[PDB]
Structures are given as C-alpha cells and as structure tokens.
Amino acid sequence: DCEFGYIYRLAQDYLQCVLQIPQPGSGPSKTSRVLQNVAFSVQKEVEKNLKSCLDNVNVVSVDTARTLFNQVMEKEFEDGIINWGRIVTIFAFEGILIKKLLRQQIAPDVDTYKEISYFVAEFIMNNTGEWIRQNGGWENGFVKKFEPK
C-alpha cells in the first residue's frame, strides 16, 4: 500500500481491464476490483463529454502519452487540492490514453500499457502519495469510501 509497486499494480490492473486482457490467476485485489468499477464509470462520462476535444489530439507514441498525461495532471492538481475523486480521474485518464494509443500508435507495441502504468504510478506516488497515506491508504481510505453500500 502506497509504495510504487502497489500503485503500479493498480494502474496495470486498470489498463488490463480496459484492454480486456486480465491476468489469469489469482485475480485482482479488493481495492483493484472497487477501483475498476468507479474509474470506468468516470472514463465513460469523460469520453462522452470531451469527445471532439479528445479527437483533436494524436497519441502516436508512449512519449506522446507520457507528455500529455503529465501536462494534464499538472493542470488538474495545480490548485493543491487532492481527494479520492481526483485520484479516480487519474485512472480514468490512463484508460482514455491507452485506448487512443491502441488506435493511433505509429509503431504498435504490445508492452506499451506497462509503460503507461509506470508513469501513472510515478505521478500518483510522487504527487499524491503523502495525502493517500494521511487519508487511510487504499484499504482504509479509498476502499472505505468507494466500496458498495
């Protein structure tokens, strides 16, 4: 919880969900299962509401995805506010990016989602990791908030 490895697994779990290529055995964690549901709901909403905007950017490489991600993330969190809903949008956005990359990547490579997962975990750990810890981590913060009633 809250170290790179844990967050990377969450990010990679979510991209495999979006890409419909789950790892067989032994399945995602409780946290990941709760996250997949809420993040996908947000992703759908965003894809609909920013369609034309998202059509006017070309995600042609992992570097394009990384730079677009980092620039968007910087602007999203520039006011210094962190909350669990904003954390969810990070996962929703990497889902949007991997889908665009699958369509638009000039040299399609199959290990790209692992690269996307990496820089997502890097951002989450370095920019929201202290907040996450202070608010209960994934199991006592995120899951407690978002798990079913």
């Binding site: 909403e45 965003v46 905007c53 006017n56 999203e76 809903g85 904003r86 949008t89 956005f93």
Partner: peptide, 26 residues
C-alpha cells in the same frame, strides 16, 4: 485557439470533485 490540455484538466478536476462530494463519509 482552444487549449486541449487545460480543457481536459479542467473537466477531470470538476468530475473528480463532483464524484468525491457524491459519496458521503463512509
């Protein structure tokens, strides 16, 4: 012209803040 980066960032912040408020303290 329309700033793609800021428009995406602005929307994600709004949706994140909106959803966060939607789920009460539980």
């Amino acid at each position: 012209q329309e700033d793609i980066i800021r428009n995406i960032a602005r929307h994600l912040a709004q949706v994140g803040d909106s959803m966060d408020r939607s789920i009460p303290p539980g």
